[PDB]
């Protein structure tokens, strides 16, 4: 039972599958400690194919309670 998310800087860069915290949450700032999407999100497709970004709350990156999950994120910072 391991929910994970998908990220890439460009939709056609190298999208990657990565595990997340059970809350549907991830250390956003700790993520930005590099080029991972850093502090901003977009993503492609398993929703509405809309380039939409991921929640940032008090340093956390949060996915919706039970929305989609692990779309292929586009990378914005």
Curated annotation (Swiss-Prot):
Superkingdom: Eukaryota
PTM section of the record: Hyperphosphorylated in hippocampus, neocortex, and spinal cord from individuals affected with ALS and FTLDU. Phosphorylated upon cellular stress.
Tissue-wise expression: Ubiquitously expressed. In particular, expression is high in pancreas, placenta, lung, genital tract and spleen.
Record function comment: RNA-binding protein that is involved in various steps of RNA biogenesis and processing. Preferentially binds, via its two RNA recognition motifs RRM1 and RRM2, to GU-repeats on RNA molecules predominantly localized within long introns and in the 3'UTR of mRNAs. In turn, regulates the splicing of many non-coding and protein-coding RNAs including proteins involved in neuronal survival, as well as mRNAs that encode proteins relevant for neurodegenerative diseases. Plays a role in maintaining mitochondrial homeostasis by regulating the processing of mitochondrial transcripts.
Notes concerning its domains: Consists of an N-terminal domain (NTD) and two tandem RNA recognition motifs, RRM1 and RRM2, followed by a C-terminal glycine-rich region. Contains a nuclear localization sequence and is mostly nuclear; however, its nuclear export sequence permits it to transport mRNAs to the cytoplasm and even to synapses as part of neuronal granules.
Record: disease: Amyotrophic lateral sclerosis 10: A neurodegenerative disorder affecting upper motor neurons in the brain and lower motor neurons in the brain stem and spinal cord, resulting in fatal paralysis. Sensory abnormalities are absent. The pathologic hallmarks of the disease include pallor of the corticospinal tract due to loss of motor neurons, presence of ubiquitin-positive inclusions within surviving motor neurons, and deposition of pathologic aggregates. The etiology of amyotrophic lateral sclerosis is likely to be multifactorial, involving both genetic and environmental factors.
The name this protein goes by in its record: TAR DNA-binding protein 43
Organism ancestry: Eukaryota, Metazoa, Chordata, Craniata, Vertebrata
Gene this protein is translated from: TARDBP
Segment of the intact protein contained: 1 to 77 of 414
């Amino acid at each position: 039972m391991s929910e994970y998310i998908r990220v890439t800087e460009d939709e056609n860069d190298e999208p990657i599958e990565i595990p997340s915290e059970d809350d549907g949450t991830v250390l956003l700032s700790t993520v930005t400690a590099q080029f991972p999407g850093a502090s901003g999100l977009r993503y492609r497709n398993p929703v509405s194919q809309s380039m939409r970004g991921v929640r940032l709350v008090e340093g956390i990156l949060h996915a919706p309670d039970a929305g989609w999950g692990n779309l292929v994120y586009v990378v914005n910072y």
